[PDB]
Every structure is written in C-alpha cells, then in structure tokens.
Symmetry: C3
C-alpha cells in the first residue's frame, strides 16, 4: 500500500467518522514514555488494525492504537505504539500515518525518544532538544522519501534546514526554567543509527569525530515526512547513558538499563509535555 | 529485467535497426543542462518506452529519450532524461542503458550534474572537474553492483582508482583557458548523497570534515557501471550554492534557486562540451 | 525462507542424521585460505543444495559445502564457500547457516578474511586480530538484524561491546610468539565496506580520518548473528596492501594481486589456526 493521497484520504475518513475530534496537534511518544496518552480526556482509542490502509503490525506485536481526545484544552492525536524501520517496515508504511495526521488537520508534531549520549557534557537522565540531524540511512540510499514523489503532500527535493522549529525549542526551555529543571536540558545534533544493534564502541568514537551529540534508531523518518508536508516539529531525546565513557571504561548498555532510566524520568517528561501542549501558540 | 548480456543485446539490436548511427561517445546531461541535445545533427529520437528491455519511467514522468546523431563531426548517443536512484529505480534499471552504450561501441562517457558546494573555495556558478568520489550508498550495501556479477561486461571486484580519466580533465581545463573562463574551473571530490532531501546543515559540516568538496544525488552509479566495462569518463559539476556558508548564515537552498543557476550557465556549458566532443582523441 | 527456529531446526536435523558429529567449534575461511578444511579428519561433506532451507547459491556458482569432522581432537563444522552480501543475498540467507551452527552445539566461531590496510603501520602480508568494527551498512539501515526479531535466538537490541572475545585474541597472539612470527601480528578496527568495488582513493582517506585500521566486505554480518545468539568469535584479517600508500603513489589493487598474497601466507595461517583449535579452552 503506497502512502499516496487517495489511500491516506480513506484512512482519514474512517477516523473522522469514528472519533468526532479534529486535532491540530500530533504526538509520538518514545519507549516507556507513553503515560501522557493514558491521561487524554474524552478520548477515543482506534486499533491500527481497524483503520483502512494502516500498516500491518502483527509480526512485531505489542500495542498499536491511534488515540484522539483533549489535553490542556487542545485537540490532539497520539500514536500509541510507534513504527521503527529496524523492524523491516517500508518507507510507505512509516509515512502513511504522518500523512493521515496532515489530512486530519495536524499543524504541530511533538516527539520523544530514548538515545545514547556522545557529547561529553551529557549524562544519564539528561534531556536534549534536537536542533538538527545526521541521517546515515539517507546519505546511503535508504531515505524515507526514496520512491516516487507524492506531489499533493510536498516537493520532490525538500530543504530540512528548518525541520526543528526554533520557537518550539525556546518554549520547551522556558517551561523547564519555570519549574527549575533547566540544569537537565541541553541542545544537540541527533545521529540516526538504523539499528537494531546499539552503536559499537568504535562507532561511538566515530560519531564523536563527526559532530554528533546523541544517537538513536527513530525520529528522523517521521521528521522528514512531517517537514515535507509542512508540519512543525519539536523532538526531545532522553539520554540513557554516555557511550563514549562506556567505551573508555569497557562497560555495556542493554534494553533493561534503558527502560529503568525511562521509568525514572517518565513523570517529569509527562508534566513537561502537558504544559508544552497547553502553551503552544 | 536484469542488466545482462542477452537483454542489453536485444535493446542494442533495435537501436541499430532504427538509427543507422554507430556512436563512440555517450553523454548524460544534468538538470537544466540539456540544450546541447537539441543541436545534435541528422539526429534520431527514440523514446525509452519503445526500446526492448529499457526501464519503465512513467511513474516519475517527464522526458525519456535516447538521441543519436553527430556533434562536431563525431558520432554520439545522448540520454535525454536521466534516471536517478532516489526515484526508486533498481541497480539493474540504472545499469542497463550504460551497458547498451557499451554494446553500441561507446568508448567515452561525458557527464554533467548540479551539486552543492562544500569546499570553502567554491561559489555559486563555479564548475568542478570531478577527480574522485565518496560513495555513501556503496559503503552502506547499496552499491550499484550489488547482485550477481555479469561477467561479459567486467570483473567481480572493480578498481575505481582511474575511473575519472586524467587526460580528459586536462583537455577540459585547456579549453576553458583558451576561452578565458578558467577562473571558474576547480577540481574536487564528489560525495554521493542518495537523496532526495538536500544535505542538512549538520550533514554539510560532516562532509567538510571528511574531505568532500561537492555533494550530489547522481553520477556515481553511472560512473561505476562505465568503469566496470572499460568506458572512460569525464564528469563536471555546476555548483548552485555553498552549503557550509548557508549553514553559518541560516539560509536555505531549494529547487527553484538551483534551476536559476543552471539557466545562467547553460549556454557556456553547451559551448564548452561541444568543443570537448570535437577535440576528443 | 526466514532464519527462524523452525527452519533452522529442520536443517540441523538433516545434518545430524547424515554426519554423526556434534561440533562445538565452527569455522569460516576467507578467500584462498581454505586449505585447513581439506585436512579435517573422518570428515563428511554436505552440499548446501542438499540441506533443507539452506540458501540457493547457484547464481553465484562455485563451491558451497558444509564439512564436519575432527581437528586436533576437537569436533568442528566448516563453511566451505562463504556467502557475501555484495552477491545480493538477504539478511535471512546470511543468518540461517550461523543459527544452524548454534542448534548443532557450536560455542566458538573462528573467522578469517582478506582486507585492505588503512593504518600506516600495516603492510602486505601482515595479520590483524579484529578487536572492534565500524558497520557502515548497519548505520545506514542495512544491518543483518533488520526485520522481525527471532526471540528464540537472542534479544531485540544486542550489545556488541564484547563481540570479539579478548581471551581468544590473547591465545592467538601467544601461539604466534611461540612460533616467532609475532612481528606479523597487529590488532585493529575493521570497517565493513558493503562492496563489491574496492574502496576508492578518497574513501580510503576518509576511513583513515574515522579511525579504521582495515577494510573488507565480509565478517561483520556473521559476527553480529553469532553475538546475538551467544557464540564467541575470533576474527583475523590478512592484509593484501596499504590503500593509503597506494593512494599517495597512484597505484592500484586488483583480485589477482589479492589472491597472490593469500597464496603466500596460506600455509602459515593453516598451521596457526590448527593450533588455535587444539588449544581452545
Ligand atoms: O542507537 C541507539 N543507541 C542507544 C543507546 C541508548 C539508548 F537508550 C538508545 C539508543 C539508540 O536507539
Ligand atoms: O545532494 C545535493 N545537494 C545539492 C545542493 C544543490 C544542488 F544544486 C544540488 C544538490 C545535490 O543533488
Ligand atoms: O573492501 C575491501 N578492500 C580490500 C582491499 C584488499 C583486499 F585484499 C580486500 C579488500 C576488502 O574486501
């Protein structure tokens, strides 16, 4: 199924008939960081499997729902269960839910993820406002836009220099200051590792030489589809470790350690993003 | 359809029956840089769609013709409408037209493209003689030769150290000097960005660290197929902008700005390449 | 055919019925470096084409056998004819033979390859104990684990920091010292070039900047599948040339020159690895 205008239009028609909500904000929450979705008001839960033309997610399993409702007086749509390219999904499968958001009226997309720290100033538990990226799959002929261009959504050759909205970064920082946790908040460049292996010790050292501040396996595909069709983006990484220190000390990361950091910061991130949604222009 | 000996042979037989031209020079012109093809003498235009085993190009649309005839007394074949890997074409689709050129008798392939400047000495409107490349798709398992080797055309493991003929670079420079535009002409290393997004500001900074002088989304796949089967190559980039300066100043590129630079240099490039064809050994 | 538990189990059942050998050591030998396999004792040769669910290898051709028997009193299984991703094999085809080794009881995998030298201390004929890697395909969305995870074999997100066992590296060095060829033996980081073109002169210079010591087109996919399912690895490169010196001097490599270096070191490598097998804990 191609992520074209006709196919996205059929999915949007179903969603509108079932939910009665017209959202102007979309959210994609990182692993272990989804508690906000369980606080959406007057909400409607829609399994992906019920939506015409949505990608099949049963091989990977686990939760996959679209959730619509209200937060802080604002109308939102959330992806509960995000799709990752290391699972084998195609370009078209990743893009179609973002283009459905566009047709539903979304103007701003808020994203969180878990990432490894490269910059020596970053420690476990820190947050990074993403200000740019290095797309290793894109340089290497695996960009999410490889294929025919879908002209109704955007141009053949997108400019990504303003993909990460500067005013949304400022608002996120302002709220952290108001609540006295600004000592946790940095800005930085995100490296997209296709995955699913964690960067090796020598890959981490290479990323440091190339000016990367953090590394993860998500986010850049959605950002590019959103920028192509004119949706503004804020993206925030939660740092689980510093891979450069780990390489110097011969220490390892694993998924268990990552999820324990997510649990330690989940409630603060939930409150932060509730206020961001409330304050959006 | 595989780019094998039998399939390329059938396409070549059709072309020979229709055109009566046996070319020893091939040309592939970059976007907005195709006016020379409209000056080919006693010419024959052959739509791709008419040629057995040529790749289907109707999803992308726009022009797709093989043009045969004479320039400066020399017999040439031109691709009018080049295939780009960011459109989703396979390795086999890109390679088959180059291998048909080989079977028709082509010994020299001349290529132009539009590119972004990385080296700080490069400005909008400059020309770069390509002397080497950095193939990000090839390091990353998307080389144009991934697949069975077609032994009739070349070896399993090609050496690319002489892919860009030094004597053709010297002849191109000599002609620029004769016409007093040598102040526009540089040499440099071409980075292959799979595309279709322009390099991000932080990707540009990374390319500078790695010794890249220019960046584009074409040319390296054709160069590798030509080198594999023993065709000599000259490749020239027209620089639309300097991406490093743009990153420092928070300024953007787009396709409209690129095509306006092409229009400004098209007539000089046309005259330059007509003389190169005339003077080839 | 997916590299899942059921499919690997059927291949292992066939092998056990035919060979009567239960191996705890596996070996994969590099090109021109396979003579040890012809010295396996009380051996059984099994063509790939006879084994249920083994990948089809007839397009590439040449030898493809599983060989079981005894070396130095130890029970081993060898791949005679290794699969390379530049031939077009999928992730699933590369992984299935390694997962069959796991089900047969393999606990240690020994690997050799031919590689180009990047580090200025490396010369033709030197050996490199691999201590880490830089996986360009993996950063670029062509990791061998992209796809559904096969949970019976390993975790969704593997940690590769101990992929190259330190004690096996020490044992290999100890034996070289005992036989007074330790002046040939280095350690270093392996860059995975997807291939099949040799790294270009400007790619070599880039690899030097990024901290790579050697470059090759194999080994990293098998290492990652082995690490995922808990098999210990020793991997050794035989250096055919120094690509940085060749770039400075405008000299070329080719497959003929590579195989001549393999012939010159084959007998020493055979004796070295026989002793390693004999001495394994
Ligand atoms: O590539 C990755 N490395 C890494 C390390 C730690 C994390 F919490 C998350 C990731 C990223 O997905
Ligand atoms: O990757 C690319 N960047 C870029 C920038 C400006 C151009 F005129 C052309 C391109 C290349 O196709
Ligand atoms: O990528 C490669 N370069 C290279 C150079 C020389 C070799 F003997 C082997 C290789 C590797 O397969």
């Amino acid at each position: 199924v191609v992520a074209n205008y006709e196919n996205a239009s059929m999915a949007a028609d179903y969603i509108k008939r079932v939910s009665n909500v017209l959202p102007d904000i979309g959210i994609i929450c990182g692993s272990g960081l989804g508690k906000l979705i369980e606080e959406i008001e007057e909400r409607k839960v829609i399994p992906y499997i019920n939506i015409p033309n949505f990608p099949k997610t049963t091989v990977a399993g686990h939760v996959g729902n679209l959730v619509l409702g209200s937060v802080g007086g604002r109308k939102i749509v959330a992806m509960q269960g995000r799709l990752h390219m290391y699972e084998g999904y195609s370009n078209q499968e990743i893009a179609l839910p973002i283009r459905v958001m566009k047709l539903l009226g979304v103007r701003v997309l808020l994203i969180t993820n878990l990432a490894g720290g490269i910059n020596r100033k970053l420690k476990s538990g820190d947050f990074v406002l993403i200000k740019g990226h290095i797309n290793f799959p894109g340089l290497g002929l695996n960009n999410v836009l490889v294929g025919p261009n879908q002209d109704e959504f955007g141009p053949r050759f997108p400019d990504l220099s303003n993909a990460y909205d500067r005013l949304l970064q400022q608002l996120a920082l302002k709220i952290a200051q108001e609540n006295d946790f600004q000592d946790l908040v940095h800005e930085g460049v995100y490296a997209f590792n296709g995955g699913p292996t964690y960067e090796s010790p020598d890959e981490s050292n290479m990323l440091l030489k190339l000016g990367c501040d953090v590394v993860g396996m998500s986010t850049v595909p959605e950002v590019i589809i959103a920028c192509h069709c004119g949706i503004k983006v804020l993206a925030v990484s939660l740092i689980a470790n510093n891979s450069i220190l780990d390489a110097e000390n011969d220490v390892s990361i694993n998924h268990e350690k990552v999820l324990a950091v997510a649990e330690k910061r989940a409630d603060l991130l939930q409150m932060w993003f509730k206020e961001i949604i409330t304050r959006l222009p």
